[PDB]
Structure formats: C-alpha cells, structure tokens
Design a binder for this molecule. Sequence first.
Ligand SMILES: Nc1ncnc2c1ncn2[C@@H]1O[C@H](COP(=O)(O)OP(=O)(O)OP(=O)(O)O)[C@@H](O)[C@H]1O
Ligand SMILES: Nc1ncnc2c1ncn2[C@@H]1O[C@H](COP(=O)(O)OP(=O)(O)OP(=O)(O)O)[C@@H](O)[C@H]1O
Ligand SMILES: Nc1ncnc2c1ncn2[C@@H]1O[C@H](COP(=O)(O)OP(=O)(O)OP(=O)(O)O)[C@@H](O)[C@H]1O
Ligand SMILES: Nc1ncnc2c1ncn2[C@@H]1O[C@H](COP(=O)(O)OP(=O)(O)OP(=O)(O)O)[C@@H](O)[C@H]1O
Ligand SMILES: Nc1ncnc2c1ncn2[C@@H]1O[C@H](COP(=O)(O)OP(=O)(O)OP(=O)(O)O)[C@@H](O)[C@H]1O
Ligand SMILES: Nc1ncnc2c1ncn2[C@@H]1O[C@H](COP(=O)(O)OP(=O)(O)OP(=O)(O)O)[C@@H](O)[C@H]1O
Lengths: 157, 157, 157, 157, 157, 157
Amino acid sequence: MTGAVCPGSFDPVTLGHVDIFERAAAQFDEVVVAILVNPAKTGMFDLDERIAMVKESTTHLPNLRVQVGHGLVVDFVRSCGMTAIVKGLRTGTDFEYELQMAQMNKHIAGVDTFFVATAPRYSFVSSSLAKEVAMLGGDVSELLPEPVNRRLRDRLN
Amino acid sequence: MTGAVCPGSFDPVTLGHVDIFERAAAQFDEVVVAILVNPAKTGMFDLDERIAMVKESTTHLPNLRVQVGHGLVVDFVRSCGMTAIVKGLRTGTDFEYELQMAQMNKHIAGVDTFFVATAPRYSFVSSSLAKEVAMLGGDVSELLPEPVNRRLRDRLN
Amino acid sequence: MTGAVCPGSFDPVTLGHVDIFERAAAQFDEVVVAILVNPAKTGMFDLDERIAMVKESTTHLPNLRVQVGHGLVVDFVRSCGMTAIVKGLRTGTDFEYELQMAQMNKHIAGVDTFFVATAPRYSFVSSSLAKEVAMLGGDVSELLPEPVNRRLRDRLN
Amino acid sequence: MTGAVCPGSFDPVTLGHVDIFERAAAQFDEVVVAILVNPAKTGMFDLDERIAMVKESTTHLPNLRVQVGHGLVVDFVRSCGMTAIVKGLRTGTDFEYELQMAQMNKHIAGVDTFFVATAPRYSFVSSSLAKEVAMLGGDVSELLPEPVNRRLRDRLN
Amino acid sequence: MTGAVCPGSFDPVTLGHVDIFERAAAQFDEVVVAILVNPAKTGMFDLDERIAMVKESTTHLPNLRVQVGHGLVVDFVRSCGMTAIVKGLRTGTDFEYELQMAQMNKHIAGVDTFFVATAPRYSFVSSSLAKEVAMLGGDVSELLPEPVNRRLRDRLN
Amino acid sequence: MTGAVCPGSFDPVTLGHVDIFERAAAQFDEVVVAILVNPAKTGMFDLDERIAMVKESTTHLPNLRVQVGHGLVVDFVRSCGMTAIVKGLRTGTDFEYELQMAQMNKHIAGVDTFFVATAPRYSFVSSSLAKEVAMLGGDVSELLPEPVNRRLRDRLN
Ligand SMILES: Nc1ncnc2c1ncn2[C@@H]1O[C@H](COP(=O)(O)OP(=O)(O)OP(=O)(O)O)[C@@H](O)[C@H]1O
Ligand SMILES: Nc1ncnc2c1ncn2[C@@H]1O[C@H](COP(=O)(O)OP(=O)(O)OP(=O)(O)O)[C@@H](O)[C@H]1O
Ligand SMILES: Nc1ncnc2c1ncn2[C@@H]1O[C@H](COP(=O)(O)OP(=O)(O)OP(=O)(O)O)[C@@H](O)[C@H]1O
Ligand SMILES: Nc1ncnc2c1ncn2[C@@H]1O[C@H](COP(=O)(O)OP(=O)(O)OP(=O)(O)O)[C@@H](O)[C@H]1O
Ligand SMILES: Nc1ncnc2c1ncn2[C@@H]1O[C@H](COP(=O)(O)OP(=O)(O)OP(=O)(O)O)[C@@H](O)[C@H]1O
Ligand SMILES: Nc1ncnc2c1ncn2[C@@H]1O[C@H](COP(=O)(O)OP(=O)(O)OP(=O)(O)O)[C@@H](O)[C@H]1O
C-alpha cells in the first residue's frame, strides 16, 4: 500500500495544512503527519500541543496518523513504511525552497515528493503570519481549525 | 484503484517527460498519458507519431497506457476512471502556469493535481527548445528517448 | 478631484476585475474603465458587448463610468481628466509585466500606477482561461458576473 | 477625505522611500508615515532618530505627517482616520511578501493596500544594504536623503 | 584572445543593449554583436537597418564588430573564433529564459554564457515596448541611441 | 590582464562552486576566490579550513588563487588588481539577491559583475543544505569535492 508523509512544523496547524492532509488522504492508502520541531526553542506550541492540535483537527480522516519526526524526512519515509512525501505550495518562494529539498531528497534516498497547490482561499495563510497577527490582537479564527482557535484563545491571556 | 492522468502535447516526448511518467507509475495503480493536440496545426509530429513515440518509450511501465485527449482534462479524469492529474514542474514559470490551471481544475470539477519536480539533469529540457535546436543542426539525442531520436533523424532529411 | 483609469481588454470582464473596480471606486473620486481592444481581431466579444458587460456589472458603483480607450493609456489619463492608473496583480508574472509598463508610463508621461492584490478567491481567474474552459464545456459561472454568464450562455450555442 | 498610511521600519529612510511618500502624497489627501520598530533591539537608529530623519526629508510634503506605529497596521488605519495602506515594490520578493500581508490585512479588517513600483534608479536601494555598505566604508550618499547622510557621517565615527 | 558574442534581434538596438556591449567590450578582447532575425517577417527594421543602427551606436567601442547570425549561436561561437556568449538580464523572466538557453548551449557545445545585470535606469527598456509606445506617439528618445531615434523619426511618418 | 574575483563564504566549498571556478578560470587571465567569513561565529569550518578546502579542490586550475576577503568586494577588486566579479546563479532567489548586489556594486565603485548559470546537476546544491543533511546522517559525498568529504567524515565524529 502507498503512504505519504506530510512533514512540517505545524506551529500551529492551519486550515491550509488540513486542506493538504485531506487531499493527500484521498489519494494515498495512509498519511502520516510528521511533526519536526526546529532546534531553536522559539516556537509557540510545544511538541505535545502540536500533536494534539493536528489529531483533533483530522478526526474526519481515518487513514491519517500523527507522529513526531526525527532526522531526515527520507529516513522516516523509508524506515517507517511510507512511499512518498507530500507538501503544499502557496507561492513562488515555496516552490523554489521545496524544489531544492525535493531534488536533494531524491538524490540522497530516491524518495519522491509530490506537491499540491494551495486552495486559493488559504493562499496567504501561514503559521508564522497567523501567530504574529493573533499576538497583536487580530482575528485569525477563520484561518485555523477550531481546536487551534480554542488553544490560541487560552494562550493569549 | 487510484489513477493518474499525465496530460500534455508531447511533441515530441522527452526524457524529462518519461521521468515524470516513471515517477507517477511508481505511485499510482495506473497512469494514462493523455495527448492533447493544440488547435493550431503547427506542431512537428502528428497525433499518431506522438502516440507511438510515447508507447515505444514506456514499454518498461506495464501500468501505463497512452490515449488521445479531447476537451477538458478534468472530464477525461472523471469519465475515464482516473483519480488525479500529475504534472511536472521545471521552473517558476511552470509553477505559475500550472498553479492557475490546478486551481481552476479543482474549482470546476473537484479534481486534484499533484506536481513533481524535474530531475535536475532535465530541468532545461523542453519539447520546443529541443525541436528548435534539432532543426538548426544541434545534437539533442541525450535529451530524448531513442524512439524519438530515430524519428527525428528521419524527419530532418 | 482624483481619478483612476483601469485599462484592460475585459474580454470578458470577470469577478476579479469587478473586485478591482470596487476597490478603486472606494479610494478615488471617479473611476474610468478603459476598454482597449487589441489590433488582432481574435477576441471573443466585440467592443460594444465588452462595454455593455462592464456597465451592467458595475451598476452598484455610481462613481464609475466605462469608455473605449485609444492609444496610450497615459494620454487617456492626461487628456481625459484622470490622475492615476489602477491595475490588479494576481501573480509574479503580472507583477513583472505591470512593473515594466508602470515604469515606462512614469517615464514617458509622469503618470503614476497603483496596483492592488487580487482577492485570494479570484487569484486563478483570467478572461483567457475562463473563455477556454467555457468553450470546452466547463462551468465558470461562479467566476464571472451574471451579465457575462447570460451572454456566455447564448454565445456557446 | 482619503488617507494613506505608509508603514515601515525606515532604519534609515532612503530616497526610494521618499519617492513613495511623494507619490502617495500626490494621490491621497493626507499621508501618515508609520514607523514600526521591530522587537529585536538590533537596529541602527533609535525611534526618535528615525522620526527626525523622515520629518527632515519630507518638508516639501505639507500633507504628510510622521507617527510611531504600535500593533497592527490595520488598527492604525481604522482608528487613526486613514482609508488605505500604501507600500512600494522593488522586486518579486517584495511582491510575494507584500501580497501575503495585503491579503491578510484585507481579511482581518477590510483594509485595502495599494502598491507602487519602485523608480528604476532606486530599485536596488534598501535600508539594510545601504547600512551594510556604509559600515564597510562604501559611499551611499546618492541613495539617501541629506538629513540621513548627515547623521550617517556622524554615526560612522 | 577571448571573445564574446552578444546575440539578439536588436529591432531596434536600445541604450540597454549598448550598455551591455560596453560592459562586454571592457572585459573581452573582442565582442561580436550577432544579429539574429526571427523567421516571422514581422519585425520593424530590416537586417541592414539593424546592422547600421548597431554600428552607428557603437563607434566608441573599437574592439566590437557587428555581424549577421545564422543558425545556432554556439556554432557561431565555435566557428567564428569566440570563446563565450554574453547576455543581459533585466527581470526574473529574462533569467528563467536565459538560464534554460545557457544550460542547453553548454550541453550541446560546451559553450559558456555570462550574464550581466541591467543598469537600473534601463531595466524597463525593451525593443518591443519601445516600438509599441513609439508607434502610439510616445516619446522614447531617452531610451534609444540617437542613430535609432533619427531612423524612428523617419519611419513614423 | 583581466581578473575575476569569486567571493563567497564557501563553508564548505561544493562541486557547484568548483564548477563556477573552472568556468571563470577558462575565461579570465586570473581568478581569486575571496573567502568572506560572516560576522556571526556560527559557521561549520574556520577560515583556515575553508581556505585549505578550496586550494585542495582547485589544484587543476593553475591560474586561480585563494585569499581571505575583508570589507567590500569592490575594494578587493580595485585594490588587489582584478577587473570583475563572477558569481553563480542557481535560482530566481539567487538572481534577485545577486542583481541587487551587482547594481549596488556598480553604483558605488563602477565594478562589473558577470553571472554564470549553475550546471543542471548541481542546481539544488548549497553549502547550507549539504551541511544540514550531512549532520543528520545523509550522504552528500557526490555533491562535494573529495577534500571536503575527507574533512566532513572527520568532523561528524
Ligand atoms: N495554505 C497552504 N496551502 C498549501 N500548503 C501549505 C499551506 N500552508 C503551508 N503549506 C505547506 O505545508 C507544509 C508544512 O508547513 P510548515 O508548518 O512546515 O510551515 P509553514 O506553514 O510554511 O509556516 P510559515 O508559513 O509560518 O513558514 C509546507 O510544504 C508548506 O509549504
Ligand atoms: N524536464 C521536465 N521535468 C518535469 N516535468 C516536465 C519536464 N518537461 C516538461 N514537463 C511537464 O510535462 C507536462 C506536459 O508537457 P508538454 O508536452 O505539454 O509541454 P512542454 O514539455 O512544457 O513543452 P514546451 O516546454 O516546449 O512548452 C507539463 O506539466 C510540463 O510542465
Ligand atoms: N483576479 C484578478 N485580480 C486582480 N486583478 C486582475 C484579476 N484578473 C485580471 N486582473 C487585472 O486586470 C487588469 C486588466 O486585465 P485584462 O482584461 O487586460 O487581462 P487579463 O484578465 O489578465 O486577461 P488574461 O488573464 O486572459 O490575459 C490587469 O491589470 C490584470 O492584471
Ligand atoms: N526603492 C524602493 N522603491 C519602492 N518601495 C520601496 C523601496 N525601498 C523600500 N520600499 C518599500 O518601503 C516599504 C517600507 O520599507 P521598510 O523600511 O519596512 O523596509 P526595506 O526598505 O525593505 O528594508 P530592507 O530593504 O533593508 O529590508 C516597504 O513596502 C518596502 O517594500
Ligand atoms: N535593458 C537591458 N539591460 C540588460 N540586458 C538587456 C536589456 N534589454 C535587453 N537585454 C538583453 O539583450 C539581449 C538581446 O535582446 P533582444 O534584442 O534579443 O531582445 P529584447 O531587448 O529582450 O527584446 P524584447 O524585450 O522586445 O523582447 C538579451 O539577453 C536581453 O535579455
Ligand atoms: N550549484 C551552484 N551553481 C552555481 N553557482 C553557485 C552554486 N552554489 C552556489 N553558487 C554561488 O556561489 C557564490 C558563493 O556562494 P556562497 O558560498 O557565498 O553561498 P551558497 O553556496 O549560496 O550558500 P547557501 O546556498 O548555503 O546559502 C554565490 O554567487 C552563489 O550563488
């Protein structure tokens, strides 16, 4: 059976992310959302918060599971029984970054990457910008899953 | 079972194209290469030549078949039993063009598109440029499948 | 009083276009939609059809009028009592094209151009793609104003 | 009356910036340059220096005033009596960044953003690069207003 | 001795082009401007006009000569005693196009291409846009060499 | 005699870098690789390691020498007897960054920059990504010169 890994920091997961999960889940036998926390401790939500938000936001996808990633995505793919990497693209910047990483990943491990285009309505949505706006008092609730909104409302006070 | 359509004009098919076919075929149960001939009669090879070149260049992919496309790709996908569209991206220009078409296709029919990154060695390869160079006496044989080279050698004299 | 010209071919006008008109009309005392028909006779709707579709789609904008353009946009701006040009940007390609034309226009006539970002939901909408999809039997009615849909329904049969 | 906010860090203000101010001031009843100092204390000039440099560089624009910004630009716009945001674009990178922020700003507050193209002669001018060159002994005086040059000459020794 | 070919259609040559010639001529022992006329007869100036305009605009560059090109640029380079191709880049679009052609040229013939960045003041200048503006009555004389202006003034009436 | 400076951090030098050196060395009388270490102490290899890796990787280029850079590249060019700067471009991002720096460098010192396109096979290779992959246990030996591989093998344990 085929399997797609969707790696990312998901800090926090957005509706753009969930859209990608849904589209991967419709095409692959199983999907694994791999949460990679960047070495620099400066992130809004801790690993367990990130995991819980993704799980709670994907209860409608029975063939998806959430796991913490360690090391190279390609090692996660090969060791943990997947067949491909799936990532979303919003912009030309995403494309350039992801193209480089995909070619590097194919080179080092023979692992393929498939990209999907953002839904137009979420094209401007990013975890970073949503966090920045939320912290300055802006309403980003329409851009994030309810389980994230619930936690953002508590975290801001 | 899942099924990917890889639409294009393939005039002629290149090693970049075959690379995409191979990568789709490894991920989807079946692949259909859909040849769409553009209304303007100005193309190098006729439909039957295009079909034959793709077939001859993909004998190593048992789960791939070649068909002529008519009308919207999304109608081909829905009527003819596929589940997704697969396209390759070499450049920022490809990305912008393909992003627009993918969003349009999702809007009109709910059909998803997955993109794959060009292999680095074929990033500069296009049917148009290969044809243009070949017609001016340049050697493009390393960029095209042997069945195409064989036919290009005959067509040039 | 300030005045913005929104030049384009509008063949046909889309909801993306109307969105730009609305945003210009909210900022400038008056707006003039200038229809420029390209020398090559290959366009879907004739000048009068184009004019009527824009008028019918902008009845809610009392400070907007529709006119046919001739020659340089900058001459239309200076002679016909406007103060600026307003154009929409969807993509990096639009940006590069429009940047060049804006700098050229500032150079030759001192006329400024202001750009507005596409609404995310219409980012993939273009007259060309909508026409192409419609002619192949695709449903683009959610992307175009009703006065355009009405005429497209008649033109297709 | 219409009003444009031109937000930025202006550390320091450049001739590219002043060019944008001039073009906004010619189109809007009033302009407010909103200085936003980024949380990280690593900036060349303190808030008061930044304010003074902009004021001194815009004495020829009677309808412009300088203010310090706090929080979301869109809140500054709505509370402080403006109608729009105006920003300059030099490059594709600026376009992608500003497009995202404009769509986010329209989403959260309904506030429009208008972009203007850089003057060709200042396209390569940025506060960061000018500061970096100046600190290594390069002559950037033709890229910055005299009030900035005067202060840069003192700051370097 | 080193030699650079600067291929193009030069219809007509602009000040942007001359800027590139000057910069190549300062770096290479000799420069050859190779005029390639595109198969489609739709160009403003005939080959001899193009040749004359370049010659007349480069009298200050003793190490430059003008020639008509036939076939692949790389064949002109190898047969006619040059060592490299030199081309200018204004935009991201130029970069993508020229990158592809350079990689193709290196592949087929081992010939290197060096790119130079446009001067900021000519970044928006192109033969096509200048011709289009001139034909609509716009003043482009500051963008073109005097020998071109002289001929454009005669051609317009 | 002509002379090209190829500035960079080379931390570490990659096969992409060596490719550029080779292509510069074939066109200019001499080449100087100028190693610029960024103020932030966070780099993998110290200056002397960087110098040694470049020297050891370029023994086949008799007209190339390696030096440490201080201050503006343009001062190194003018004082140290070079005539031009040479840099490689892989991506649209490189192009935008390098275009800005080249225009700034021409403005402040009259020094020209020539760009060369990446070899397709190294387009995705960067020092940063190679280091990141290597530190996570990925095999990047095909992307780096043997003298770098030898040192990377020791540094990882
Ligand atoms: N709206 C969206 N549509 C499609 N893909 C997206 C969207 N937002 C993010 N992605 C993709 O999801 C993947 C994981 O994203 P990740 O959480 O690592 O960063 P991110 O959302 O880009 O964060 P930021 O935008 O703040 O840098 C990446 O491929 C990213 O491009
Ligand atoms: N080297 C390559 N790597 C990956 N995808 C590619 C490559 N070359 C073409 N493609 C993709 O293959 C699909 C079909 O291509 P098609 O034959 O329609 O045009 P094309 O190869 O782009 O022709 P041209 O480049 O001459 O316009 C498109 O998605 C295109 O982006
Ligand atoms: N969805 C949109 N959002 C914002 N601006 C748009 C949108 N669609 C078009 N525009 C802009 O409207 C202006 C006039 O467009 P015009 O009718 O000339 O061509 P167009 O819509 O780009 O047609 P095509 O996309 O088929 O080439 C241009 O500035 C264009 O960039
Ligand atoms: N030369 C220029 N022409 C037009 N707009 C500009 C120019 N330089 C900066 N801008 C715009 O001015 C606004 C405020 O700029 P800000 O001071 O925040 O950063 P900046 O000049 O981009 O600094 P840096 O380039 O160092 O990051 C932004 O919209 C920016 O894009
Ligand atoms: N202002 C400029 N600065 C630097 N290089 C330029 C400039 N204008 C054109 N060039 C380059 O000169 C070379 C030859 O140009 P050519 O005459 O073939 O077309 P062009 O000027 O791009 O015409 P158009 O812009 O109308 O398509 C190309 O490399 C082109 O990128
Ligand atoms: N594969 C490549 N092909 C051509 N040029 C390259 C390649 N890799 C790097 N360069 C260029 O070499 C020059 C010096 O590179 P430098 O070591 O400063 O950074 P870098 O390789 O871009 O590092 P990183 O990619 O990690 O930021 C720059 O012009 C860079 O664009």
